């Protein structure tokens, strides 16, 4: 039809590849994903159509609210007697006359009550019912839901900053008249034995092709559950490098019914010089998406070895054949039994679990030998009920001894009372024993749900089991707010890389959330799109992007405009660092301006939503305000008009830095973690203001960075006006009089925050042109080069002078750092978990759990709350 050809052209553009390419994919898993996912699409579209046009508006302009209606004591103390001063704006007559109406209302007022008082005031000013809506002046953020006004982020931030909220009164019908009438059309592509095998596992390594030039070679193999070998690893015999034929059977110490559901064969082609080196690697799921055990002849195309890979194998690495068929190819053979072997149904596993529990009960009583894994009922003293609890309080990095595993497993039934112990109990399971796993499955099936920040721990590479992953996703489904999902979205997108298959519970959850909240969908699209260059994820992320773009609605036209802008900016920056590298800034800006006159560029670089914050419209390009930045990778400082009617009340112009060359992933994460640290400190009632400015990776070392207006480096302040006293006097000048005290206070609070944040995270060498200051005293670090490898931010005399060593002001400052450091130590498991979820991401500063172990050192986790306070006190003394 006509509507479907337009859709697939638009979807093709958004993803980067035509939809017809997915149809040419002969693999039932890909075609089943494409068809079976469409129910998540259906459900989301139905929810948007439920209370139309309201429910559709809530999809496009979801409330930007905090997770709790409750405000900290320090925030409520900023409200004059628990009341807020709000300015409500009305656009009057054809002459678009802006008319303000100031209210002093209860902070906990619902938008329909704030609208009511506004109408009351508007009537009085001379001496209407629920047909109106509130909007933030200067951006596309609406107050469409019944939340207390103070819960909306813009408002809470206003109370925080001491700024006055500026809202615009709009008619519901003016907003609904803007939302287009969509239509979700159905695509064209849509329309045995078990545990009865009494045998051990063996895999034949037939031969290798596309392996030749540069002593001897062998194939290394292992059977893995996550990054854990389910048995000892087996090698083929060494062979001459040009002639790679083995035709050897490799025998493993695992019996076929003992294979867990998420069992993988991990393999690599290694060289010998002696000095062993992996040449290529590949991993295969022992069971397909249909639960069918792999049988017969199979060929696998291997992958290039990742930079900084420790062992000869890559178990954490992606499953499946390399799509480039002109790569080292390894031919393998698996045993073929009676028919097609399928992993048992849940009821079959239930019977074996009820059987194993009974034959375990009878087993000993009647054994004769000893066992630390046999669950002894009633025999649980108060001293070992204290041992289990203390075990559950250990961080995810801390080792669980073999004796501790036998202890947790024999106590598997009491553990259900301390539900947060589950990650440790799951690690204690002998995943090579089907008897234990059937019993663990039953325990999980009825386990109490746990806090989302604890459930995310079950979503890294240590937990491959589909039931454990299903449990985690199930906890997220019930307890994860849209605020918290948005906050942890980059880690939840990364962990899709640890998923054995295309179709899973996590992919279904995230997609439903993306197709029912456009703010989640925007970043869900961008985090997936930004990795479409990685051949390891292209198909998975591509297929998920196709199913997203098919059901997102009119936002695909908006995302397509964003994709066109970014593409033209890459084209432009490619030519400036290649063809015109040694040309003058004047000659290069002349090329840009000549290229700007071309109609396809005029359209693409204006009239689109900001990919950093889609609530921001980018109008006309103010070329006179633009520039090629003097940095090596040629960043573009870009300036657009904010076409909002009330642009003046937020920012008249939007300024974004476009950069092609630098990998922005490390910045993206450090900035997120800074935002989480600041949100922790705020919840704990200590206002240590941070600046987690926007930074978004849009592809292969390409991205957008938010410009912070009215900011200058420490160096620049020292320069104009060697010298080490200028800092205080500059701030004294920029904030003269009564205003000064608030600026000194804003400098200290911000400074304490970054001292602790940089120390905990181990941020790269801090200098005069890495740290910045705003006219009001707000201090913030930039350029997050390398993390987790020590005191980087050395508090010089400059910073100390502004604060006030032997003062009431510096004692106040030390107390700010102590309170902040202790607050992050209490939340250490969360940070550990976020960094762990990021091991899938090819970040060279985060390749192994060893890199994450640095936070355990800086947060003194193996010590005590007092021994840690002493550890940080000592580290901060070493200037």
Query: How many whole angstroms separate alpha carbon 252 and alpha carbon 273?
Result: 27
- Beta-carbon count within 10 A of 562 CB: 22
Q: Which residues contact 123 (CB under 8 A, 6 or more apart)?
A: none
Please measure the distance between the N-terminal and C-terminal CA atoms of the chain and give it in whole angstroms.
Answer: 71
> Cα dihedral angle (630, 632, 635, 637), rounded to 10 degrees?
-10
Query: How many whole angstroms separate alpha carbon 80 and alpha carbon 723?
Result: 43
Residue ranges in 411-451 assigned as alpha helix (H) = 412-415, 422-428, 434-445
- Name the architecture of domain 195-335: Sandwich (2.60)
Query: How many whole angstroms separate alpha carbon 522 and alpha carbon 510?
Result: 12
Cβ–Cβ < 8 Å for 302, 327:
yes
Cβ–Cβ < 8 Å for 280, 321:
no
What is the fold, at CATH topology level, of the domain defined by 336-552?
Answer: 1.25.40
Q: How far is CA 626 from CA 561, 584, 608, 651, 658, in A?
A: 20, 16, 17, 16, 11
Q: Which residues contact 377 (CB under 8 A, 6 or more apart)?
A: 413
Nearest to 789 by CA among 843, 842, 854, 838: 854
Residue ranges in 133-177 assigned as alpha helix (H) = 153-161, 172-176
Q: How far is CA 91 from CA 167, 781, 784, in A?
A: 11, 40, 43
Query: How many whole angstroms separate alpha carbon 870 and alpha carbon 564?
Result: 54
Task: List the structure tokens of 764.
Answer: 């790269």
Task: List the structure tokens of 626.
Answer: 């633009």
Cβ–Cβ < 8 Å for 537, 531:
yes
Strand (E) or helix (H) holding 292: none
Task: List the structure tokens of 717.
Answer: 């302040």
Query: How many whole angstroms separate alpha carbon 549 and alpha carbon 444?
Result: 35
3-class secondary-structure state, position 656: strand
Task: List the structure tokens of 3.
Answer: 């509507």
Q: How far is CA 808 from CA 656, 804, 811, 812, in A?
A: 41, 8, 5, 6
Rounded (10°) angle between helices 585-596 and 555-577: 150
What is the CATH number that goes with domain 1-194?
3.10.20.90
- Beta-carbon count within 10 A of 541 CB: 22
- Strands of 443-502 (E only): list them: none
- Beta-carbon count within 10 A of 245 CB: 13
Cβ–Cβ < 8 Å for 773, 807:
no
List phi, psi (to 5°) of 445. -50, -35
Q: Are strands 234-235 and 216-225 parallel, antiparallel or unpaired?
A: antiparallel
Q: After which residues is the chain broken (C to N over 2.5 A)?
A: 127, 191, 214, 273, 721, 789, 804
Domain with CATH 3.30.1010.10 in the chain: 553-709
Nearest to 552 by CA among 589, 524, 518: 518
Query: How many whole angstroms separate alpha carbon 85 and alpha carbon 150?
Result: 11
Of the CATH numbers 3.30.750.24, 1.10.1070.11, 3.40.640.10, 1.20.1250.20, which one belongs to the domain with range 710-879? 1.10.1070.11
Handedness of CA 286, 291, 296, 300 (dihedral sign): negative
**Chain centre to alpha carbon of residue 99:** 42
Query: How many whole angstroms separate alpha carbon 197 and alpha carbon 290?
Result: 18
Residue ranges in 488-598 assigned as alpha helix (H) = 489-494, 505-514, 518-529, 538-549, 555-577, 585-596
Residue ranges in 578-637 assigned as alpha helix (H) = 585-596, 599-604
Strand (E) or helix (H) holding 614: strand 613-618
Query: How many whole angstroms separate alpha carbon 430 and alpha carbon 416?
Result: 18
Question: What are residue 208's DSSP bridge partners?
Answer: 330
Measured at the CA of 28, the angle between CA 24 and CA 34, to 5 degrees, comes to 75
Q: How far is CA 713 from CA 630, 771, 791, in A?
A: 16, 6, 20
**Percentages helix, strand, coil for the chain, rounded to the nearest 5?**
45, 20, 40
- Beta-carbon count within 10 A of 345 CB: 11
Cβ–Cβ < 8 Å for 114, 165:
no
Measured at the CA of 286, the angle between CA 283 and CA 287, to 5 degrees, comes to 125
Q: Is the peptide bond before 470 cis (omega within 30 degrees of 0)?
A: no
Task: List the structure tokens of 51.
Answer: 């209370």
3-class secondary-structure state, position 250: strand
Domain with CATH 1.10.1070.11 in the chain: 710-879
Task: List the structure tokens of 226.
Answer: 């996550």
Domain with CATH 2.60.40.150 in the chain: 195-335
- Beta-carbon count within 10 A of 508 CB: 17
Nearest to 748 by CA among 790, 778, 775: 778
Query: How many whole angstroms separate alpha carbon 170 and alpha carbon 142?
Result: 10
Query: How many whole angstroms separate alpha carbon 174 and alpha carbon 714?
Result: 48
Under DSSP, the state recorded for 841 is: S
Query: How many whole angstroms separate alpha carbon 545 and alpha carbon 15?
Result: 6
> Cα dihedral angle (437, 440, 442, 446), rounded to 10 degrees?
-160
Q: Are strands 608-610 and 613-618 parallel, antiparallel or unpaired?
A: antiparallel
Query: How many whole angstroms separate alpha carbon 268 and alpha carbon 281?
Result: 4
**Chain centre to alpha carbon of residue 201:** 38
Cβ–Cβ < 8 Å for 747, 731:
yes
List phi, psi (to 5°) of 337. -100, -160
- What is the residue whose two structure tokens read 């942890």? 488
Nearest to 527 by CA among 667, 384, 762, 696: 696
Domain with CATH 3.10.20.90 in the chain: 1-194
Domain with CATH 1.25.40.70 in the chain: 336-552
Question: What are residue 200's DSSP bridge partners?
Answer: 255
Number of H helices, E strands in the chain: 35, 24
**Chain centre to alpha carbon of residue 71:** 26
- Beta-carbon count within 10 A of 537 CB: 19
What is the fold, at CATH topology level, of the domain defined by 553-709?
Answer: 3.30.1010
3-class secondary-structure state, position 110: coil
Cβ–Cβ < 8 Å for 113, 107:
no
Task: List the structure tokens of 85.
Answer: 């001063």
Q: Which residues contact 131 (CB under 8 A, 6 or more apart)?
A: 171, 172, 173
Query: How many whole angstroms separate alpha carbon 809 and alpha carbon 813?
Result: 6
Experimental determination technique = X-ray
Nearest to 460 by CA among 411, 394, 397, 380: 397
Measured at the CA of 750, the angle between CA 729 and CA 832, to 5 degrees, comes to 150
Query: How many whole angstroms separate alpha carbon 666 and alpha carbon 846?
Result: 9
Query: How many whole angstroms separate alpha carbon 510 and alpha carbon 216?
Result: 47
Give the CA radius of gyration of the chain.
30
Cβ–Cβ < 8 Å for 825, 868:
yes
Task: List the structure tokens of 600.
Answer: 């396809």
- Strands of 107-149 (E only): list them: 132-136
Q: Are strands 83-92 and 166-171 parallel, antiparallel or unpaired?
A: parallel
């Amino acid at each position: 039809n006509r509507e479907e050809k337009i859709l697939n052209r638009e979807i093709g553009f958004a993803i980067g590849m035509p939809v017809c390419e997915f149809d040419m994919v002969k693999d039932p898993e890909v075609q089943d994903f494409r068809r079976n996912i469409l129910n998540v699409c259906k459900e989301a579209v139905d929810l948007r159509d439920l209370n139309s046009p309201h429910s559709r508006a809530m999809y496009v302009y979801p409330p930007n609210v905090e997770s709790s209606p409750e405000l900290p004591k320090h925030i409520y103390n900023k409200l004059d007697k628990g009341q807020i001063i709000v300015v409500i704006w009305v656009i009057v007559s054809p002459n678009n006359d802006k008319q303000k109406y100031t209210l002093k209302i209860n902070h906990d007022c619902v938008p329909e009550q704030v609208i009511a008082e506004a109408i009351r005031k508007k009537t009085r000013s001379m001496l209407y019912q629920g047909k109106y809506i509130l909007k933030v002046c200067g951006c596309d953020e609406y107050f469409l839901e019944k939340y207390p006004l103070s819960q909306y982020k813009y408002i809470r931030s206003c109370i925080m900053l001491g700024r006055m909220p500026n809202l615009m009164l709009m008619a519901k019908e003016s907003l609904y008249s803007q939302l287009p009438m969509d239509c979700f059309t159905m695509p064209s592509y849509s329309r045995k034995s078990l545990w009865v095998i009494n045998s051990a596992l063996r895999i034949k390594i037939l031969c290798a092709t596309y392996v030749n030039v540069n002593d001897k070679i062998y194939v290394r193999t292992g059977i893995y559950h996550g990054g854990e070998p389910l048995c000892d690893n087996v090698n083929t015999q060494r062979v001459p490098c040009s002639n790679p034929r083995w035709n050897e059977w490799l025998n493993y110490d695992i019996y076929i019914p003992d294979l867990p559901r998420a069992a993988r064969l991990c393999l690599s082609i290694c060289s010998v010089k002696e000095e062993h080196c992996p040449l290529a690697w590949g991993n295969i799921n022992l069971f397909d998406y249909t639960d069918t055990l792999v049988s017969g002849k199979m060929a696998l195309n291997l992958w290039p070895v990742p930079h900084g890979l420790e062992d000869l194998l890559n178990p954490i690495g992606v499953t499946g054949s390399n799509p480039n068929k002109e790569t080292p190819c390894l031919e393998l053979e698996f045993d073929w039994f009676s028919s097609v072997v399928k992993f048992p149904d849940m009821s079959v596993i239930e019977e074996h679990a009820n059987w194993s529990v009974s034959r375990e009960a009878g087993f000993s009583y009647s054994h004769a030998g000893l066992s630390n894994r046999l669950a002894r009922d009633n025999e649980l003293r108060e001293n070992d009920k204290e041992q289990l609890k203390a075990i559950s309080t250990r961080d995810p990095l801390s080792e669980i001894t073999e004796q501790e595993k036998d202890f947790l497993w024999s106590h598997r039934h009491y553990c259900v009372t301390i539900p947060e112990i589950l990650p440790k109990l799951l690690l204690s399971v002998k995943w090579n024993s089907r008897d234990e796993v059937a019993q663990m499955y039953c325990l999980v099936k009825d386990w109490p749900p746990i806090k989302p920040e604890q459930a995310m721990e079950l979503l890294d590479c240590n937990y491959p089991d589909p039931m454990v992953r299903g449990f985690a996703v199930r906890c997220l489904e019930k307890y994860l707010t849209d605020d918290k999902l948005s906050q942890y979205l980059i880690q939840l997108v990364q962990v899709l890389k640890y998923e054995q298959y295309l179709d899973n519970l996590l992919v279904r959850f995230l997609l439903k959330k993306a197709l029912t909240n456009q703010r989640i969908g925007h970043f869900f699209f961008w985090h997936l799109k930004s990795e479409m260059h990685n051949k390891t994820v292209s198909q998975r992320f591509g297929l998920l992007l196709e199913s997203y773009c098919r059901a997102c609605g009119m936002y695909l036209k908006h995302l397509n405009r964003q994709v066109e802008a970014m593409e033209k900016l890459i084209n432009l920056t490619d030519i400036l660092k290649q063809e015109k590298k040694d040309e003058t800034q004047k000659v290069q800006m002349k090329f840009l301006v000549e290229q700007m006159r071309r109609p396809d560029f005029m359209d693409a670089l204006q009239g689109f939503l900001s990919p950093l914050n889609p609530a921001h419209q980018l109008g006309n390009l103010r070329l006179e305000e633009c520039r090629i930045m003097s940095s090596a990778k040629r960043p573009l400082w870009l300036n657009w008009e904010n076409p909002d009617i009330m642009s003046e009340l937020l920012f008249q112009n939007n300024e974004i830095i476009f950069k092609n060359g630098d990998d922005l992933r490390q910045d993206m994460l450090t900035l997120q973690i800074i935002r989480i640290m600041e949100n922790i400190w705020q919840n704990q009632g200590l206002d240590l203001r941070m600046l987690p400015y926007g930074c978004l990776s849009i592809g292969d070392c390409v991205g957008l960075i938010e410009v912070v207006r009215n900011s200058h480096t420490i160096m620049q302040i020292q320069c104009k006006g060697f010298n080490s006293h200028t800092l205080h006097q500059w701030l004294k000048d920029k904030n003269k009089g009564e205003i000064y005290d608030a600026a000194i206070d804003l400098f200290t609070r911000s400074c304490a925050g970054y001292c602790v944040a940089t120390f905990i995270l181990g941020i790269g060498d801090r200098h005069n042109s890495n740290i910045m200051v705003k006219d009001d005293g707000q201090l913030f670090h930039i350029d997050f080069g390398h993390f987790l490898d020590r005191v980087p931010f050395v508090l010089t005399q400059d910073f100390l002078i502004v604060i006030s060593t032997k003062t009431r002001e510096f004692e106040r400052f030390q107390e700010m750092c102590y309170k902040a450091y202790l607050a992050i130590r209490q939340h250490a498991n969360l940070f550990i978990n976020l960094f762990s979820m990021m091991l899938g991401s090819g970040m060279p500063e985060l390749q192994s759990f060893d890199d994450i172990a640095y936070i355990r050192k800086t947060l003194a986790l193996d010590k005590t709350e007092q021994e840690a306070l002493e550890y940080f006190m000592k580290q901060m003394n070493d200037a």
